[PDB]
């Protein structure tokens with residue numbers, strides 16, 4: 001099996017659909033990655049995650065290095081064995097969470113409480129976890145930022161990107177079996193995004209993430225930045241938008257050339273009682289669902305919608321029952337995967353523009 | 366299919382093993398019933414409950430009448446449809462929980478806050494839920510109690526038992542498709558237990574519960590009372606010990622003629638980090654399991670023990686992850702079902718005495 005082989009099968013405008021072949025499996029793109037923070041996709045067994053259609057999940061380096069610890073997970077046989085997911089795992093670098101969840105920043109890296117993270121240590125931690133797609137250690141520039149502060153931050157991220165590349169390449173077993181993605185920064189500024197893209201391309205990565213855009217800038221601004229940022233990245237490698245997003249965010253980002261996504265929304269909002277449907281999100285705890293015998297979504301193919309009603313799930317979530325969180329989460333992840341499948345098929349079939357319009361019309365109605 | 370047919374296939378001492386055939390399925394005895402309080406066996410899909418070997422689950426009349434409500438569940442198609450469990454369900458009468466969870470007691474029944482429960486209303490609620498085994502509405506005498514107070518309480522329960530019988534029999538659809546169990550009371554007093562047994566037998570029930578013994582009297586005292594109480598009940602009907610218990614409680618009660626059990630222990634203690642093993646319970650959060658790659662129990666056949674380590678489950682429970690509760694609960698219910706299976710097979714094979722001794726020796730070691 002290939003270490004990493006990205007093939008584009010079809011295009012429509014800026015949108016692409018295809019596959020990433022890796023040693024632990026094939027990733028169909030555009031892809032959505034369920035987030036598995038503390039070595040679990042919350043409230044789901046791995047077989048259930050797979051049953052929804054997920055090809056790859058995301059693990060969080062920051063969380064796992066603290067609990068249970070990277071060396072410990074390696075001693076226990078790696079993250080795949082540990083959590084019982086045998087397909088690809090992408091690990092974030094810890095660069096974002098080290099700032100949002102903990103700090104002292106310097107050229108060497110970040111020291112923090114509740115430890116030190118550097119490009120080299122991040123790569124080593126991801127090696128110990130046995131990650132399939134390794135993220136370069138970066139800095140998520142706060143939003144908003146002055147052009148000059150965004151520039152100095154992006155430039156540090158680019159130096160860290162080179163250091164991540166070198167650390168990764170130095171570890172033969174990692175270089176042979178895993179892939180490395182670089183992260184574009186530059187805030188909302190076109191010239192900095194270009195400088196960042198050029199720096200990353202000069203180094204060379206297996207894939208390129210658009211970083212710094214899951215920062216509450218709003219969809220309009222996010223799209224504006226994607227409009228010029230994604231074409232700067234190498235066309236022949238995957239484009240990964242970190243931390244995005246709602247279903248309409250995803251459709252628009254794919255329209256702008258994004259191939260990969262991760263977001264806690266389907267899992268987290270699922271536990272909180274929000275279910276995604278083709279007619280938009282619903283709050284299942286709302287009184288209007290108390291005697292509603294329809295499934296969460298009446299076109300959804302997931303196991304939850306085959307078996308249980310809105311009324312039942314309403315009851316569970318209001319009662320604080322774990323099964324409520326389980327069913328909501330499975331449905332939401334399945335919905336996200338069905339969305340990605342519809343996206344992939346429509347691009348392949350050259351009807352993605354129509355799909356996007358049809359989707360938005362119904363979802364917002 | 367039979368409404369209710371109890372067959373004893375084999376005996377050893379006071380212990381029996383056999384089957385209860387009902388319209389929604391066969392119940393292998395001795396049986397353990399997972400408790401499904403608010404129309405869910407906590408943290409388990411019904412298919413998972415079934416996969417562990419459970420033939421029947423328990424639903425709680427008190428909880429369900431408040432949330433989502435009995436008439437509502439009936440409107441939604443009954444409890445079986447509502448929660449997606451199509452096999453037998455035994456419903457408790459609400460008689461215990463109305464006192465422990467809420468009161469005004471009278472001959473008519475119990476009025477309470479956070480409503481009124483009577484033998485007739487209890488039976489009607491259980492009818493609306495679509496219960497397969499209906500419990501007579503009773504009074505769980507507090508422990509300890511004077512002989513005279515235990516007597517007046519038991520006598521009220523016996524009058525309520527007759528009223529439950531009459532209400533059940535009046536509802537043709539219920540009488541044709543469900544079964545009715547009476548509940549023996551009398552605290553720890555032999556003469557009152559006898560009076561109670563005689564009263565219940567005079568009325569006639571499909572099964573007989575030993576009530577009033579899940580009250581913190583200790584195992585020695587519980588066994589003492591079972592020693593004389595169970596032989597008072599009709600031999601040819603099932604004997605149900607409500608709210609019991611730990612694995613050794615169950616083995617001893619079967620040695621004393623009990624055929625059916627329910628307990629929240631495997632589910633509740635599972636979520637709290639206690640896993641049952643053949644070498645006794647373990648607290649999975651304990652530091653000694655942090656790098657333990659063995660399954661929860663190395664003889665257990667459950668899906669959890671086929672796939673995940675102690676170390677992983679340790680990590681999940683310490684992290685407050687829902688999957689931790691899911692895996693612990695599935696294992697614990699599976700352990701309980703494997704215990705019942707070993708009990709059934711050993712009685713059938715005429716080696717139950719040896720099994721009980723072997724079990725106790727290892728479990729307490």
Ligand SMILES: Nc1nc(-c2ccccc2)nc(=O)[nH]1
Nearest residue numbers: 095096140211212214242243
């Ligand atoms: N490492 C990194 N992570 C994220 C990020 C932000 C929000 C949700 C998820 C990831 N953004 C970045 O620019 N870098």
Ligand SMILES: Nc1nc(-c2ccccc2)nc(=O)[nH]1
Nearest residue numbers: 460461505576577579607608
């Ligand atoms: N209805 C009833 N329930 C119980 C009971 C006690 C503890 C746990 C479960 C049931 N004991 C009784 O004597 N009657």
Ligand SMILES: [Zn+2]
Nearest residue numbers: 300302305331
């Ligand atoms: Zn669904």
Ligand SMILES: [Zn+2]
Nearest residue numbers: 665667670696
């Ligand atoms: Zn097990």
